[PDB]
Each structure stands twice: as C-alpha cells, then as structure tokens.
C-alpha cells in the first residue's frame, strides 16, 4: 500500500508478454492487483499484475512494449505501490485503439474482422488497466499487431481520461488519417462526409 522499491526485470515467457501484465512473484503480490509504478516525481504508470513462479522476489518483470512505453530499463530500481480503481468512475464504456502490423515483414492485404477483434481483445484484457497513449502487442489468429490507446470513455455519458476495460465495454475503431485501411462491419464510428459541394 505504502509502496516499496523493486528491480525491473525481463518478461519470463512469450505468453505473459502478450498479456500486457506486469509479471511478479507470488511472495510479493497476488494476480489481478493493480499497481502504480514510479520512475520519477513526474512519471507514474499503472500496470496489472500476474504472478509467475520464475520471478525472483523483489523484482517486477516487464515486456519490451511495456519498457518502451514506460521508459524502463532492465535492472533499474522502481517504486511500486498498490493501486485501487474507483469502479463507479473508472470503468470503460468505449476505447479507441490505433492498430497496425507489428512486424513489417508480415504485412498482408487480407481482411481482419473488427467484430472478432473486439471480442478477442475483451477476452484477453478484461479486468486489466489501460491508459491513453499506452502501447502493447496484441495477438489475433497468430498475427501480432501493435496497438496504441487513443481515447477512453466511462461506463454508463460522462467523458473520462482513464478507465478500466470490462467485459461489456463497446469499442469503436476509426482509421487514422492517411491510412489505406479498409474497415467493415460495426464496432466503428463511420463519421459524416464533408461533400465538395458548397451551400
């Protein structure tokens, strides 16, 4: 609760790397808890925990995407304190995620069904913390995608800056400007269209 010093480590397994969860030892925490990681007075980042037997006590393991988003280095000292969400205000009703192929060698023009994307995303990341601008890697039909959180909205229509994704959250995807991505189906915004005609 008060916070303790910990050493940053590397993620132990590929499976835990895709979970976007900070991996800890059972002797220190319990799976599902949320912590706030402090690297400086102006840098506080929230992560969800998942225990693994291989983590040495006194250390927290992070995946490469987390270290890049979090500006963390292996072996660096960090301060970790338990974080409790106010579920009345911090449950997510809608998030906007910018998605692109993680590895350029594996780019293809095949369609990807966003409706199946959203269901898999919820199944994988339910009850886990997310923040605006967070970066993570997301696997779908054995294909790796790079994700970037763009916007977050509260559960029932109050706007919020940060929240918790839950099972019944509804996600809408909008293609980034200058994107040739072809999106089909629901789970999008599909904004209006400013015609060339003048009044």
């Amino acid at each position: 609760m008060a916070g303790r010093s910990m050493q940053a480590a590397r993620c132990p397994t590929d499976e835990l790397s895709l979970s976007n969860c900070a991996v800890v030892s059972e002797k220190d925490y319990q799976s599902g808890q949320h912590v706030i990681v402090r690297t400086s007075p102006n840098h506080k980042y929230i992560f969800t925990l998942r225990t693994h037997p291989s983590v040495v006590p006194g250390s927290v393991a992070f995946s490469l995407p987390q270290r890049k988003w979090a500006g963390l280095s292996i072996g660096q000292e960090i301060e970790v304190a338990l974080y409790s969400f106010d579920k009345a205000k911090q449950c997510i009703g809608t998030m906007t995620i910018e998605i692109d192929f993680l590895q350029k060698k594996n780019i293809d023009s095949n369609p990807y069904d966003t409706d199946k994307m959203a269901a898999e995303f919820i199944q994988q990341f339910n009850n886990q913390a997310f923040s605006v601008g967070q970066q993570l890697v997301f696997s779908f039909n054995d294909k790796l995608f790079g994700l970037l959180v763009k916007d977050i909205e509260a559960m029932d229509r109050q706007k919020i800056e940060v929240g918790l994704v839950v099972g019944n959250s509804q996600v809408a995807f909008e293609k980034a400007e200058n994107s040739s991505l072809n999106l089909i189906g629901k789970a999008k915004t599909k904004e209006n269209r400013q015609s060339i005609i003048n009044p």
């Binding site: 890049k68 500006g71 280095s73 350029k104 060698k105």
Partner: protein, 289 residues
C-alpha cells in the same frame, strides 16, 4: 667518419678519466674526507662526457652515462639536479631502447611531484602515454596514464588541455572498452563546450559520436538519447548529421541492407569518412540479422 672517429676517440679518453674519477670518489669516501666537492667535479665531467656522447650518435652510451651520473648525484642531499639528469637520461633513451626510459621517467615523475610542480609532471605523464602507445602494443596502461594526466590538468583549471586529454582517452576506450564511459565523457565535454563559444560550433561532432556509441548497443534508447540531445540543443535538428541518423535508424528498422549501404555511401560521397567511423558503421551492420 673521421669527425666521428676522433669524436669517439676523445669520448673513450673521457671515459678513462671518468673511471679515474670514480676511483677518486671511492678513495675520498673511504680514504679522504670532503670528497663531495671532488665527486661534484666527477659529476661535471660525467655530464661533460655524457652529453658529448649524445653528439657522437652513441645514444645508448649517453643514456648510461646520464643515469650513472644522476644516481651518484642523488647521494649529495640534492634533488633538483637529480631530476634534470633523470629527464636527460630519459631523453636519450626515447629512441633505441625505450623500456628503461619509462622507469627513469617514473622516478623523475616521483621526484617532481615530490617537489611541488604539476604541469611538468602531467606533461611528462602524457609524454609517457604517447611513447607507450606509439611503440608499445598495449592500450590499457595508456588509458590509466591519460586518466592520471586528465585528473592533474582539470584540477589545476587548465581546462583546455584537460578537455582534449579526456576526449582522446574516451574515444580510444570506445574501440575496445564498454561504451558506457564513452557516452559519459562525450556528453560531459559536449555540455561543457555548449556554453563556451569556442567549441559550440563543433560540439555537434561530439554529439554525433555519442549517438554512434549509443546506437551500437541498442536502437530504442538511442532514439531516447537523440531526442533528448535535440531537446537540449534545438539547433541539432537542422544538422545534416541528424538527418543521417534519422535515415539510418529508419532503414535499420526495415532490415534493408541496400538502403542503409547506399545512404552511408551517399554521405561518404560528400566530405570523407574516417578509419574509426567506418569501423563503427561496419560493426553495427554486421549484427543487422
């Protein structure tokens, strides 16, 4: 050579006289009293002969004569003249056989910084390092000697001479030593040069080298380093080197040998590369996978 032949002939004659003077010395320490003056005359002739050897082209004999004269002179409760002869003895030994020049210099270093003077001691330190690197095949002792010279210089406020000494040692270390030190000294000298109007126009080169040193380890923190540099130094964005880095890192992310090779060749077309940077670029390329 007739001039050298007669020069060597009289040189031998002075040696015989000097051999008679050491006989005078031993006869005046155990047989007579007050020989300090007599051996002082022996030292004068020893210096008289020793130097004339240096004009006879017989460097090895001259160095031996200087060392013998100095060591004898140390016994007379006098130290400054001991230092001068030690330095002269070394100056003769720099060529031919320099191994004993190191030992005598260290003794001269010991005496000088057993007297009160730094700038001469540190100047001899860098001289020892230069001779060590040029003719002895070993670099680690050079790092230590440059570090010791750096400590003496910067302490005495002779920042200008220190800066180059710190720069050279850090640059050489990057070749065969972990790059953490290279980053530290390069960043330190770059920041110090920033405020000063002298190196402010050239600090970009130091920033360029620091980025190359950081890039060779990993890519992600290198992006952090470069963005931090341009944040602190806004005028680094327009530098052609910054554009070169951005193209290089972007190409490397794509894993394309052709684009990286042509970009470095394009940079090489204008100006010229160096023995060091070419090796650095090749080393990073070899691990592209």
């Amino acid at each position: 050579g007739m001039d050298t032949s007669g020069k060597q002939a009289e040189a031998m004659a002075l040696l015989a006289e000097a051999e008679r003077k050491v006989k005078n010395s031993q006869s005046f320490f155990s047989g007579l009293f007050g020989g300090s003056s007599k051996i002082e005359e022996a030292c004068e002739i020893y210096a008289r002969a020793a130097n004339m050897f240096k004009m006879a082209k017989n460097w090895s004999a001259a160095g031996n004569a200087f060392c013998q004269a100095a060591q004898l002179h140390l016994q007379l409760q006098s130290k400054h003249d001991a230092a001068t002869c030690f330095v002269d003895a070394g100056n003769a030994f720099k060529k031919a056989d320099p191994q004993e020049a190191i030992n005598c210099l260290m003794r001269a270093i010991e005496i000088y910084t057993d007297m009160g003077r730094f700038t001469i001691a540190a100047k001899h330190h860098i001289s020892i390092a230069e001779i060590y690197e040029t003719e002895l095949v070993d670099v680690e002792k050079a790092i230590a000697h440059y570090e010791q010279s750096a400590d003496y210089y910067k302490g005495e406020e002779s920042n200008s001479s220190a800066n180059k000494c710190l720069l050279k040692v850090a640059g050489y270390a990057a070749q065969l030593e972990q790059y953490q030190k290279a980053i530290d000294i390069y960043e330190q000298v770059g920041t110090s040069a920033m405020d000063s109007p002298l190196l402010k126009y050239s600090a970009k080169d130091y920033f360029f080298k620091a980025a190359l040193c950081h890039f060779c380890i990993d890519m992600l923190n290198a992006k952090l380093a470069v963005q931090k540099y341009e944040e602190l130094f806004p005028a680094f964005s327009d530098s052609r080197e910054c554009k070169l880095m951005k193209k290089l890192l972007e190409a490397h992310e794509e894993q394309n040998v052709d684009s990286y090779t042509e970009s470095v060749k394009e940079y090489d077309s204008i100006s010229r590369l160096d023995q060091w940077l070419t090796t650095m670029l090749l080393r990073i390329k070899k691990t592209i996978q």
